C-alpha cells in the first residue's frame, strides 16, 4: 500500500491526464469508423439468400 510520491509527480500525473483525456478523446472515433462500415453489411445479408432458398 502506498500513496504517491510527493512532488513533480504532479506534473507527470498531469501528463497522465493528458494521456488519458486526449487518448480517450480519440478512442471513440476509432470506433466511429467501424460502426460506420458496419451498416452496409447489415443491409446486405439476406437478399439473394431469401430469394433462392425458397426457390
Amino acid at each position: 500500500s502506498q500513496v504517491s510520491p510527493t512532488r513533480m509527480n504532479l506534473l507527470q500525473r498531469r501528463g497522465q491526464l493528458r494521456l488519458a483525456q486526449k487518448g480517450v478523446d480519440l478512442l471513440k472515433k476509432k470506433r466511429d469508423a467501424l460502426v460506420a462500415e458496419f451498416f452496409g453489411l447489415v443491409r446486405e445479408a439476406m437478399e439473394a439468400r431469401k430469394a433462392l432458398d425458397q426457390a
Binding site: 460502426v35 447489415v42 445479408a45 439476406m46 431469401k50 432458398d53 425458397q54
Partner: protein
Amino acid sequence: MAVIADPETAQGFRLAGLEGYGASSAEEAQSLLETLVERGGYALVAVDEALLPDPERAVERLMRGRDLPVLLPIAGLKEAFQGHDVEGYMRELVRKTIGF
C-alpha cells in the same frame, strides 16, 4: 458442409454436394459435431428454425470462440421467411449497442 433438418427437406442435401444426417430426434447435434470437425471440410451445419438457434453452448464449451460451423435457421416450409431480417436488425442491436 453437412446438415441436419426436417426429414422432408433433408433429402436435398443427401442428393448432391452435401451430406445429410437430418432427423428430428437430436436437438443437440453433438452427435456430428465432434466427428465433423475431424476433417473440417464441413464448414457448416445449418440448423433450422424448426429447432432453436441460440443454446449452442455445448458447441461453445468446445469451440471457446472458435469459428467452426455456424448455423442459420431455415423455414422448412416457405410461406415467408424475411422476418429474421427485420428481426436480425435487432439481433445485433438489442444485445450491445443501442437497440430497437
